[PDB]
Ligand binder design. Structure first.
Ligand code: CLA
Ligand code: CLA
Ligand code: CLA
Ligand code: CLA
Ligand SMILES: CC1=C(/C=C/C(C)=C/C=C/C(C)=C/C=C/C=C(C)/C=C/C=C(C)/C=C/C2=C(C)CCCC2(C)C)C(C)(C)CCC1
Lengths: 50, 210
């Protein structure tokens, strides 16, 4: 029965699943990048750069 | 094409290519300014091509000076006022007195701005009187009404611009006159709800004396 703070220790010894969670982390970071870019475009005002 | 080169075609050949939205191109007739006799002539097919629609963007990005901005057309090939006529005197030294009374003198077109903003405007040369000598044939026209007074607003309720001609090529025999054209007119307003915008139109033209 694992504690809650060591539940990612089941992929110490499973390298394909390690690559899977590397990929999922990369996808989440890129998703933040795209969503923050679109939100910042929609908020942004180019009306006077002076 | 020229005028007879256009009228040699049939309607099945004109239909579907955009040749109909053109002035007929005039041949070599440059600088024939002494080859102009007098008379109270009329015009046969006074057509005017536009080639660039620029809008005075009133928004500032540099200082208190605003230029004209090249834009895109929006509807389709919906320009080149056709079949205009009236009364067209040629005087002594080249004083043209050109009076427009009839014909399709109006065309309503829409045009963006970079920034994603649409502006509708008329292109009207209704009732123009140009009395000048072959360089700045000046005078004013009417911008009658962008929409009729019987127009329904979406919830069921409810001027003069500048125009400068020029003359470049003159056919001495048949009187075919080409030239360049400029104009500045206001935009549409929805009756004071939106302030108007200045619009410059440049182009060419064509006419046949008779
Ligand atoms: C590069 C970053 C990184 C990586 C890959 C790891 C990886 C790991 N850590 Mg770890 N750790 C890190 C940074 C990192 N750590 C930091 C900075 C600290 C100090 C705060 C710790 C403190 C720490 C402890 C004390 C322990 C681990 C443990 C572990 C292992 C299992 C994790 C687990 O199941 O916990 C699962 C944990 C959770 C499900 C809790 C997540 C809830 C968080 C707090 C809120 C959400 C955060 C939110 C999304 C914002 C984060 C985004 C960004 C700002 C980072 C695993 C190998 C465990 C270990 O050694 O194995 C026995 C362990 O006991 N880590
Ligand atoms: C020469 C072969 C090769 C190449 C090119 C890579 C490249 C990479 N490895 Mg990798 N690796 C290799 C051999 C290789 N490794 C070997 C021999 C092993 C041991 C068996 C591993 C074990 C390993 C682990 C355990 C992990 C990596 C990870 C990564 C990535 C880290 C950076 C990243 O995510 O960029 C971001 C990536 C992109 C922006 C995508 C760019 C496009 C790429 C090239 C893929 C395009 C499709 C491609 C043809 C599919 C095959 C992928 C790969 C096998 C070539 C990176 C793409 C980490 C990972 O999974 O990252 C997610 C990770 O945790 N590697
Ligand atoms: C430099 C780049 C970098 C690094 C090294 C990390 C590192 C980490 N990220 Mg991460 N992330 C990044 C950039 C980065 N991030 C970016 C740019 C984004 C997009 C916004 C994310 C979005 C993201 C998500 C959505 C998730 C992670 C998670 C994780 C953790 C996975 C390891 C783990 O489970 O161990 C165990 C990790 C810990 C015990 C974390 C302790 C350290 C953190 C920093 C605690 C501080 C948080 C703070 C108290 C506020 C709480 C947040 C809460 C209110 C939401 C690890 C700490 C995952 C996670 O939380 O792990 C389950 C997760 O789900 N990240
Ligand atoms: C296809 C590849 C690709 C490309 C071309 C881009 C391009 C871009 N990304 Mg991006 N991104 C990608 C993949 C890609 N990304 C992936 C896979 C992720 C997920 C991890 C992200 C996550 C991401 C985020 C979260 C953000 C961007 C942003 C950006 C933009 C600005 C980049 C910037 O300032 O970073 C500057 C980059 C650096 C300073 C690089 C730091 C790397 C350090 C220095 C490496 C140090 C260690 C290294 C191993 C060196 C040791 C070896 C040594 C011997 C040489 C740019 C358009 C930003 C943006 O505009 O917002 C949307 C932004 O915020 N990206
Ligand atoms: C599948 C697919 C698709 C779709 C995609 C998508 C749409 C995705 C998603 C995307 C997204 C949309 C993502 C998202 C992202 C975001 C995130 C991931 C976030 C994060 C955050 C964080 C992490 C934070 C934390 C915290 C708080 C809460 C606040 C403060 C700060 C802190 C740090 C504390 C496509 C189309 C391509 C097609 C193909 C298929």
């Amino acid at each position: 029965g694992l504690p809650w703070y060591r539940v990612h220790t089941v992929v110490i010894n499973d390298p394909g699943r390690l690559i899977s969670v590397h990929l999922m982390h990369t996808a989440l970071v890129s998703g933040w990048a795209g969503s923050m870019a679109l939100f910042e475009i929609s908020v942004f005002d180019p009306s006077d750069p002076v | 094409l020229t005028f007879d080169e256009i009228q040699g075609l049939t309607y099945l050949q004109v239909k579907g290519s955009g040749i109909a939205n053109t002035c007929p191109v005039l041949e070599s007739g440059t600088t024939n300014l002494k080859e102009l006799k007098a008379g109270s002539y009329k015009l046969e097919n006074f057509c005017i091509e536009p080639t660039s629609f620029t809008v005075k963007e009133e928004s500032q990005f540099k200082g208190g000076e605003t230029e004209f901005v090249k834009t895109k057309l929006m509807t389709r090939l919906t320009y080149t006022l056709d079949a205009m006529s009236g009364s067209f005197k040629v005087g002594s030294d080249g004083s043209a007195e050109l009076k427009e009374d009839d014909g399709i003198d109006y065309a309503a077109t829409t045009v963006q701005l970079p920034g994603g903003e649409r502006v509708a405007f008329l292109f009207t040369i209704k009732q123009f009187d140009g009395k000048g000598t072959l360089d700045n044939i000046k005078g004013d026209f009417l911008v009658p009404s962008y929409r009729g007074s019987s127009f329904l607003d979406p919830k069921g309720r409810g001027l003069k611009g500048s125009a400068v001609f020029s003359v470049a090529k003159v056919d001495p025999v048949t009187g075919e006159i080409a030239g360049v054209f400029e104009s500045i007119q206001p935009s549409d307003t929805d009756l004071g709800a939106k302030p108007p915008k200045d619009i410059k139109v440049t182009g060419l033209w064509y006419a046949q004396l008779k």
